[PDB]
Amino acid sequence: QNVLTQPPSVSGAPGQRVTISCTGSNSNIGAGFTVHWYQHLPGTAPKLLIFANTNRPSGVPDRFSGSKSGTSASLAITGLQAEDEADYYCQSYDSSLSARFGGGTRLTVLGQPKAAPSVTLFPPSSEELQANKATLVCLISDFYPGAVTVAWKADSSPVNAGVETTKPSKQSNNKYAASSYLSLTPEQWKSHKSYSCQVTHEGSTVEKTVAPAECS
Amino acid sequence: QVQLVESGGGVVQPGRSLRLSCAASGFTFNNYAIHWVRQAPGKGLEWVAFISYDGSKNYYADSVKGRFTISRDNSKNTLFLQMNSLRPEDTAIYYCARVLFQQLVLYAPFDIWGQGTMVTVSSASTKGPSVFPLAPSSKSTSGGTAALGCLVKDYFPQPVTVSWNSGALTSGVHTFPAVLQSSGLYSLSSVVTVPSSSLGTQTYICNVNHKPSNTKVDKKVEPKSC
Fold first, then answer.
1. Which architecture characterizes domain B2-123 according to CATH?
2. How far away is chain B from the Cα of A35, in angstroms, using its nearest Cα?
């Protein structure tokens, strides 16, 4: 038994060329077992790209090619296109006849301008409060790249418990969205002067705040 | 047309059993080996099992050995994956895939794949959601426009569907992906952006539908006045 390592992620800009390696060992690749490549976007089934190290099925474009040497294999893609953004997996076997997949490499295609997130914070509603509970909702959207840090504060202290935050996911417009929820008792809610959701993105930090009927 | 279609996934409690199926059409099934592959949440593809063209042979990943059984019926174009003693760690979308070459060829690639079927192993129980209004305010008002929404709380399992004004309002709406609480239940929020100069003159109601528990909720959202 053994494994196949793949770099978790790779990038390149459109029209350029990138390479994705698959590193195995004397027990799979090194022993003669062949390597196949699949391309994958989760809302779809995988697609066979290359088989038996360097073979390409018909239907599969020119731009994709494979090579192999010693205990490693590699996949090259030229003329990067948007549509090439996806996960790519190498796959081989071992002396059991168990197929073995590598961890996957997600490829990112450069070229999209940075985008600052719009952040929206909502306090608990009376209704939920009447039901003896309180949920604060921090909504974060339209940002790129897909990386963001979320932080909460009661007055000036950092709150850690009762927080649930989604990893971000790409929307149809190519930008990301994420959410963070803070679960509190109605006693804490009324016990502090304000709560804040702070979001950091690429050097930018925006912070929104809410307070219990601080009406006036 | 060649095609593989898996069936039988759904929600289950740990320790129970579930049998999935994969039916072929468009080609001579008895001439090919078939495999099952799965992909857990946030994880990569993982090979599960395989069975030879004539069923005389089979094999399994170490992670299912002893719990899963593969089998096929060469009189009906169907293959089966019997899963017993399911664990939360078996949660995944499962795919069946055919190899490229007929009969006993080895190391052949996976050329045709079905669309997969989802299996969720949880202890949670089916629960419709609680729905609360997220009222608009100066606190998030007049950017010229205002933001208001519906918070859809504690439900299981996915998915939920939200619409506003019964389909009539479709622009400005943004439904966020659900969060999985540690409690095993999900929560999500749907927001809409609207002209802040007509609030109160216009009515907004979010329509929430949770198929799994046969619960629909309508909730009007209104600007308070604290």
1. Sandwich (2.60)
2. 9
